[PDB]
Design a protein around this ligand. Structure first.
Ligand SMILES: [Mg+2]
Ligand SMILES: [Mg+2]
Ligand SMILES: [Mg+2]
Ligand SMILES: [Mg+2]
Ligand SMILES: [Mg+2]
Ligand SMILES: [Mg+2]
Ligand SMILES: [Mg+2]
Ligand SMILES: [Mg+2]
Ligand SMILES: [Mg+2]
Ligand SMILES: [Mg+2]
Ligand SMILES: [Mg+2]
Ligand SMILES: [Mg+2]
Ligand SMILES: [Mg+2]
Ligand SMILES: [Mg+2]
Ligand SMILES: [Mg+2]
Ligand SMILES: [Mg+2]
Ligand SMILES: [Mg+2]
Ligand SMILES: [Mg+2]
Ligand SMILES: [Mg+2]
Ligand SMILES: [Mg+2]
Ligand SMILES: [Mg+2]
Ligand SMILES: [Mg+2]
Ligand SMILES: [Mg+2]
Ligand SMILES: [Mg+2]
Ligand SMILES: [Mg+2]
Ligand SMILES: [Mg+2]
Ligand SMILES: [Mg+2]
Ligand SMILES: [Mg+2]
Ligand SMILES: [Mg+2]
Ligand SMILES: [Mg+2]
Ligand SMILES: [Mg+2]
Ligand SMILES: [Mg+2]
Ligand SMILES: [Mg+2]
Ligand SMILES: [Mg+2]
Ligand SMILES: [Mg+2]
Ligand SMILES: [Mg+2]
Ligand SMILES: [Mg+2]
Ligand SMILES: [Mg+2]
Ligand SMILES: [Mg+2]
Ligand SMILES: [Mg+2]
Ligand SMILES: [Mg+2]
Ligand SMILES: [Mg+2]
Ligand SMILES: [Mg+2]
Ligand SMILES: [Mg+2]
Ligand SMILES: [Mg+2]
Ligand SMILES: [Mg+2]
Ligand SMILES: [Mg+2]
Ligand SMILES: [Mg+2]
Ligand SMILES: [Mg+2]
Ligand SMILES: [Mg+2]
Ligand SMILES: [Mg+2]
Lengths: 93, 271, 46
RNA sequence: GCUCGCCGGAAGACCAAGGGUUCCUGUCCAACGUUAAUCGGGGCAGGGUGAGUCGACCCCUAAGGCGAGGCCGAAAGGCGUAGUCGAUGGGAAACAGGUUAAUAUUCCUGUACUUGGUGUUACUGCGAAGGGGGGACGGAGAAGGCUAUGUUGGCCGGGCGACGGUUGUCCCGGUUUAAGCGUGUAGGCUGGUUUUCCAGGCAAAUCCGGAAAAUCAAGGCUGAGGCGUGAUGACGAGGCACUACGGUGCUGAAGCAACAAAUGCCCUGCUUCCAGGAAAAGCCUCUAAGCAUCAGGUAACAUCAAAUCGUACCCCAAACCGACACAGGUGGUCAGGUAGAGAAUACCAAGGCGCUUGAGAGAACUCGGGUGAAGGAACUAGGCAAAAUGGUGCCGUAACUUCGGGAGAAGGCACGCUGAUAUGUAGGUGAGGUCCCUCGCGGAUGGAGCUGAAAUCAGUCGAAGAUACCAGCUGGCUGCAACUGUUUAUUAAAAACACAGCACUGUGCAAACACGAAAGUGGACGUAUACGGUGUGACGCCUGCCCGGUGCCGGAAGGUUAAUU
RNA sequence: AGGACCGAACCGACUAAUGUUGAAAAAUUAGCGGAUGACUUGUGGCUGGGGGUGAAAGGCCAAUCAAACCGGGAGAUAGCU
């Protein structure tokens, strides 16, 4: 079993965009910004516990940060991971 | 047999083939095969240490029994086979107990013949005996140098050794080179001479034929610059030198044998 | 016209990478020299 | 938006490498873009990459690397055993439809499949670091059976024509459907089963190999495609409605047959040749120690798990390698129509483009092309360049020759369209029907329909019928090199190099020889019919005299002669 | 059958013209050679500088080759400009 500390610090933020909203309306899916090293099992456990819902499956992908220039110097935003969490068609956060 | 090709192209005009109908047509005996990769004449430093080697056809190694120490059990010849790794043909033999082995095929051997090794084997082609038990004057092949080590002399197609004398613990052999040599009488030899004696009548016919055997071209020294070979240089065709190897040693007549350890056994050099 | 630089990441890492440097005394001297110079990218890995 | 032009074995569509946000949306035009720019691969902000089955990761090895001990070496280090890494190779599993501005074999719908762990039940000899099988392998060639695919017919929907005609033998469009599951076909290979014995497989083995009997002769393995199902589903021309004009929502006909047909599949097959064609695991099987009414194995069912990383976009290119938005380079896959032998070539389809300065004018001269009176190599170092020849079928073809060639020698004739032979022939394919049997994806007969050359005869048009594109100039004498090949990347492709063949010479195996302070390694898991060096250079006829000089080989009496004493 | 023949892809590079501050630090256009083999090509590997490799041209070894490149001895030496 995963300890509650890990579950408390694997979720970071809910992703907000047009694709995320469409997924919520049509596929009953929430899109989350999660820790870079969280696994699908950890994400599923954390969603089931901290939001008290039932999840079918988790899809994950790593988003690479963009190279940017801020007044003549080149930076790079950090990579982050996002999860597509499919709920069990009765929960509706 | 020896077959001259029809001159239907310039590369075929001079080809002479050696065709043996008796040889097997199928795949060889898998349990007695292993892989040998090619070297290109390179040693373990990665450097060319023998020149004119490279390419050619892929080959597999046939484990050939040179010891012939399965004593007392008769064996029967099943089939003659082509061996890529040597000029002689090999014969697959079946021992009465169910073991199969490859041996060098002697002249006259054919499928169905009986062979045997040991001190009491009959004096027949293909039978291996210690040279103590072989009559003086016999022609043998696949001769050992040290007892129990495996045959080392007269293994190529058409070659044989003649037992000339028996003096005590040693026999005196006449090797194909013409050299008279002594070996211990306890070393074994196979009666009769190696088969495929027409192997030297073949004519490759074209340059590609030699490339198929893994032989690369030879550049004459007199065709190089002086920095490459002692023979190089000249305006036009010039020699004015005593012929030497690429490393400067005289190459027409100078003797290179230097082995005081084994001179006791050489009765007479090949002359 | 085939030019001389034909990129391949595997060969680049196997020839000039950090682990190829650390495999020999002379490679480790290369790394020591570059650390002394203060290079910001020590090998081709970065 | 309409019209015009260009590519279409690519200038279209995918994958690998490589690049890394160039992808999509909004906004901006200073700089960048060889001009303007409202545009952009530019600036700025935001969005976007979803996997048990695809790839990596993972199991297994190749060349090769590293390498405990070890051997060797002033030091540094070198080699290498047991091992352990290393793909460009072997190893389980998913398809069709739909959807976003941007991802989809990943999301959704439908239908599947693989491996492993647990639990229950039933049966039960399980067990490896070991044995055996298998995996597992070349080049060429020849078919036969198929499919992808196309064409035509039928069917369904629509049409009746801007100018003579067009209710028809007329015109346009559509006519699609997977994996899986069942069937085990065309065809390929192989005799099967039982018993007994055994110097073999490091021990054992019931497994493999070998031997001997008995008996049966049909049993096993592999296998494209078709057919059924998947699928009463999906898709579907088109029609109807809203459009916030990009498109959104709602329905939905027919969905068949014949013929032609691959370079794809059966096929890792078959035939043949010599130059004789990876490894290891997964997998099947056998036992050893060991365990023993346990563990373990087999089968059914249930349940759980299948993580992590990649996934946008370019990819013959403005995004990769060339300093450039550079006429260059860059591996693999797909492969429509008409003509054609064809992946050539011409015109087109799907699809994509008009190459990021224009507008005028119509001088010399330069570049790239067209034609040319009469002449026809007079040009020039030289027919350099250009012009010319050019297809298929048939007739015909010299010296010389190594008997294969020379030879496509040279030279010549026919060639379009229409009709008939013959309402479409020879041939190919082949339905219904009939009859058999081991009732089947069967055999024999039968021939409807479909497809269909080539030839002859007659007519006919033009200056010309291989009409375009495409597509040998030919012959005579001679030097050199036998020949196919190779070479001065970037002024030399040759007569130079190589070559098959020839000779000499070294080498008896711990070979000579080469790399190496060495250990070692190559030669070679080869053994004088072998290997190294040197010269010559197919083949034919041949290869003469000189051993004084310089080398090399042999000799060992005498003279001279080192360290040493 | 064949280092057989004609001929695309593919691999080359014989002739000519153009270009020569190029579109290009070796190309383009029209022709040309091989095109089942001593063929060609992808991926990975090995050989290292008096060394490699070379069907041999002193060719090639990162646009560098009768001795690569980088750093050091090094401010070499220069009866010469
Ligand atoms: Mg899913
Ligand atoms: Mg993923
Ligand atoms: Mg040689
Ligand atoms: Mg030779
Ligand atoms: Mg020369
Ligand atoms: Mg010299
Ligand atoms: Mg001369
Ligand atoms: Mg002279
Ligand atoms: Mg066109
Ligand atoms: Mg950017
Ligand atoms: Mg864009
Ligand atoms: Mg302006
Ligand atoms: Mg501008
Ligand atoms: Mg932009
Ligand atoms: Mg290894
Ligand atoms: Mg050690
Ligand atoms: Mg080592
Ligand atoms: Mg491994
Ligand atoms: Mg691979
Ligand atoms: Mg896309
Ligand atoms: Mg079909
Ligand atoms: Mg082909
Ligand atoms: Mg994509
Ligand atoms: Mg441009
Ligand atoms: Mg370009
Ligand atoms: Mg290419
Ligand atoms: Mg074309
Ligand atoms: Mg003009
Ligand atoms: Mg002109
Ligand atoms: Mg004229
Ligand atoms: Mg005229
Ligand atoms: Mg004339
Ligand atoms: Mg003249
Ligand atoms: Mg004149
Ligand atoms: Mg000309
Ligand atoms: Mg012309
Ligand atoms: Mg002359
Ligand atoms: Mg020649
Ligand atoms: Mg040149
Ligand atoms: Mg040239
Ligand atoms: Mg040795
Ligand atoms: Mg010569
Ligand atoms: Mg040819
Ligand atoms: Mg050209
Ligand atoms: Mg030719
Ligand atoms: Mg040709
Ligand atoms: Mg020279
Ligand atoms: Mg260079
Ligand atoms: Mg020097
Ligand atoms: Mg000094
Ligand atoms: Mg100075």
């Amino acid at each position: 079993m995963i300890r509650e500390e890990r579950l408390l610090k694997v979720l970071r933020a809910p992703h907000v965009s047009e694709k995320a909203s469409t997924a919520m309306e049509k596929s009953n899916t929430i899109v989350l910004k999660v820790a870079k090293d969280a696994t699908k099992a950890e994400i599923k456990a954390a969603v089931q516990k901290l939001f008290e819902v039932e999840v079918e499956v988790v899809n994950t992908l790593v988003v690479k940060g963009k190279v940017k220039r801020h007044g003549q110097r080149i930076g790079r935003r950090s990579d982050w991971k996002k999860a597509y969490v499919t709920l069990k068609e009765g929960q509706n956060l | 047999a020896v077959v001259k090709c029809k001159p239907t192209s310039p590369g075929r005009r001079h080809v002479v083939k050696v065709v043996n109908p008796e040889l097997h047509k199928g795949k060889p005996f898998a349990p007695l095969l292993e892989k040998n990769s090619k070297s290109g004449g390179r040693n373990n430093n990665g450097r060319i240490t023998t020149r004119h080697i490279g390419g050619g056809h892929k080959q597999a190694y046939r484990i050939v029994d040179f010891k012939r120490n399965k004593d007392g059990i008769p064996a029967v010849v099943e089939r003659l086979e082509y061996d890529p790794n040597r000029s002689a043909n090999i014969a697959l033999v079946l021992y009465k107990d169910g073991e199969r082995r490859y041996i060098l095929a002697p002249k006259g051997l054919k499928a169905g013949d009986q062979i045997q090794s040991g001190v009491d084997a009959a004096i027949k082609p293909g039978n291996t005996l210690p040279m103590r038990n072989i009559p003086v004057g016999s022609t043998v092949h696949n001769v050992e140098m040290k007892p129990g080590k495996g045959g080392q002399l007269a293994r190529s197609a058409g070659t044989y050794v003649q037992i000339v004398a028996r003096d005590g613990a040693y026999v005196t052999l006449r090797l194909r080179s013409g050299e008279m040599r002594k070996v211990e009488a306890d070393c074994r030899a196979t009666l009769g001479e190696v088969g495929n004696a027409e192997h030297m009548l073949r004519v490759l016919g074209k340059a590609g034929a030699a490339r198929w055997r893994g032989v690369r071209p030879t550049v004459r020294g007199t065709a190089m610059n002086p920095v490459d070979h002692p023979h190089g240089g000249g305006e036009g065709r010039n020699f004015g030198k005593h012929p030497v190897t690429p490393w400067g040693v005289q190459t027409k007549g100078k003797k290179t044998r230097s082995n005081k350890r084994t001179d006791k056994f050489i009765v007479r050099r090949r002359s | 016209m085939k030019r001389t630089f034909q990129p391949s990441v595997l060969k680049r890492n196997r020839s000039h990478g950090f682990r190829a440097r650390m495999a020999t005394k002379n490679g480790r001297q290369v790394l020591a020299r570059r650390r002394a110079k203060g290079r910001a990218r020590l090998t081709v890995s970065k």
